Amino acid sequence: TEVIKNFKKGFAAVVPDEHVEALDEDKLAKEAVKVKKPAP
């Protein structure tokens, strides 16, 4: 038992890329405060 336990200390026991292309920025819906005052 002690030989095993003293060996165990000497024993030497990342997000995958998924290669998914980027979403179209035109598809990212934007919550907007629709001001009805013209000052662009």
């Binding site: 995958p16 998914v20 292309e21 980027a22 990212l28 934007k30 405060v33 009805k36 005052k37």
Partner: protein, 287 residues
């Protein structure tokens, strides 16, 4: 021993078929209830939207939740998923849209920060070694406005600060009961678009105490009612997806019952013929 085996398989497939048909009908009832909830929550959202635009008409648009922060370094994405898992490609479509969003964010120097709603998102993201900032579970089928308030409070507190430059939500939009589409929305910072004039000689609104304080006190309520509407649409979409997936599973179990019954009858006939062959072979060996 294959005949007992085939009869047992037929029995098990019949049990599965019954269970999945029951689940499909339950999902029909529950999608009715979820559509009820959605259309009952619509009016307050409409009214707060029109009150917010009335306020913004005469406000100082400088609120942090309304300004585009220069040099965006992080982005907080809230992915809305389900708890129960008898739906179809519902969570799969959610995760595909969230991966597309993460790629769009990495293509702009922004490190995505991950908040999740549901256990399936937790599974998908812990298997992929993501570090989830905060999770929410137990209300993906009957979400209450308190859950939306809590989620949106956490998100806006992460925005105004460890800190993010914008907030996105990946959730399923429900429409027409035959198409539920995973969608990425950017909920903060809100884009200011000056649509029209609409009213020129219009009776001016009185604000109490003032327009700017009301606007900055109403904006987070608008964000949280948006998150509430998102949770409701996601619940309805999940129930629709579960109905569809359970109908598909029932049809698959029925076709499997048919194939197993054909095989069982085939081997039954084969066993009778082989037994007769042995009996008549012995009887001929004796003659």
């Amino acid at each position: 021993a294959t005949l007992r085996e085939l009869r047992g398989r037929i029995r098990s497939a019949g049990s599965i078929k019954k269970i999945t048909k029951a689940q499909e009908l339950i999902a029909t009832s529950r999608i009715a209830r979820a559509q009820a909830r959605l259309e009952s929550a619509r009016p307050y959202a409409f009214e707060i939207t029109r009150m917010l635009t009335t306020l913004a008409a005469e406000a100082a648009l400088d609120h942090p939740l309304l300004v585009e922060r220069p040099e965006p370094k992080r982005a907080g994405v809230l992915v809305v998923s389900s708890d129960r898992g008898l739906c179809g490609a519902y969570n799969a479509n959610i995760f595909r849209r969230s991966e597309e969003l993460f790629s769009l964010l990495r293509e702009a120097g922004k490190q995505p920060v991950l908040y999740v709603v549901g256990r399936k998102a937790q599974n998908y993201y812990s298997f992929r070694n993501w570090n989830i900032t905060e999770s929410w579970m137990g209300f993906s089928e009957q979400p209450t406005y308190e859950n939306a308030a809590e989620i949106a409070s956490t998100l806006v507190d992460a925005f105004l600060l460890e800190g993010v430059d914008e907030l996105h939500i990946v959730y399923t939009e429900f429409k027409s009961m035959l198409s539920q589409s995973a969608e990425a929305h950017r909920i903060a910072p809100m884009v200011v678009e000056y649509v029209e004039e609409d009213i020129g000689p219009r009776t001016l609104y009185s604000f109490e105490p003032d327009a700017t304080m009301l606007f900055e006190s109403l904006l987070p309520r608008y964000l949280t009612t948006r998150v509430y509407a998102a949770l409701l649409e996601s619940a309805a979409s999940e129930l629709a997806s579960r109905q569809r997936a359970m109908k598909s599973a029932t049809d698959n179990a029925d076709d499997l019952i048919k194939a197993l019954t054909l095989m069982a009858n085939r081997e039954r006939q084969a066993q009778i013929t082989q037994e007769i062959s042995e009996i008549v072979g012995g009887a001929n060996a004796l003659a």
